[PDB]
Amino acid sequence: VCCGYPLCHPC
């Protein structure tokens, strides 16, 4: 998904 939610990827 993003940077900051359950599914989210490495930032």
Positions of chain breaks in the chain, given as the residue before each break (C to N > 2.5 Å): none
The three-state (H, E, C) secondary structure of 1-11, written as one string: CCCCCCCCCCC
Q: Which residues contact 7 (CB under 8 A, 6 or more apart)?
A: 1
Question: What whole-number distance in Å separates Cα of residue 11 and Cα of residue 6?
Answer: 13
Contact 9, 3 (CB under 8 A): yes
Structure tokens at 8: 């989210």
Calculate the CA 1 to chain-centre distance.
Answer: 5
Note whether 7 and 1 are within 8 A (CB): yes
Task: Report how far residue 3's alpha carbon sits from residue 5's, in angstroms, rounded to the nearest whole number.
Answer: 7
Structure tokens given for 1: 């998904």
